[PDB]
Amino acid sequence: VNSFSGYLKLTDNVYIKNADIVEEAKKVKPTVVVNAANVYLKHGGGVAGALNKATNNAMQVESDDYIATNGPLKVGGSCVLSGHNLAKHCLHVVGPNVNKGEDIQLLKSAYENFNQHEVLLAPLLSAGIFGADPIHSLRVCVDTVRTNVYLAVFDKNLYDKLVSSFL
């Protein structure tokens, strides 16, 4: 039993809700919140910019130190950093940017990072400025993640469409 509320069950282990991941994080304070990051951990907009703003830029300060030490992430890769005031930890995951020419097959690799954590609050990956159709992303999530994932879907029309879709 956990403190997530109002989620619609999609499979044994995947749950979905029309919600802003930032507000879900502030309310639930989960163990792991997933950020939809780029390889430079430059949190400008979308999920990343909104999460970072909610941390008063502390996420960006921590991220810049991480990059200065370790260099950029791989597309499809991840790192665990602090969750600041939003969660115990933040799992920064890089989905492929199809508008950068990056291989959509790397979306499966990106979701594989979720399997290292028993429970996560997460957005759909690659479905923002990275291009990728959200229907495909939800499908990859369901077919890749085996741990318990609570998906926060920002756009209501998109959520309704995802819920009403079989294939």
Ligand SMILES: OC[C@@H]1[C@@H]2CC[C@@H](C2)N1c1ncnc2[nH]ccc12
């Ligand atoms: O696929 C991620 C989606 C789409 C790309 C950016 C938006 C729409 N995003 C969000 N999802 C969940 N909580 C969010 N809070 C702020 C943005 C946001």
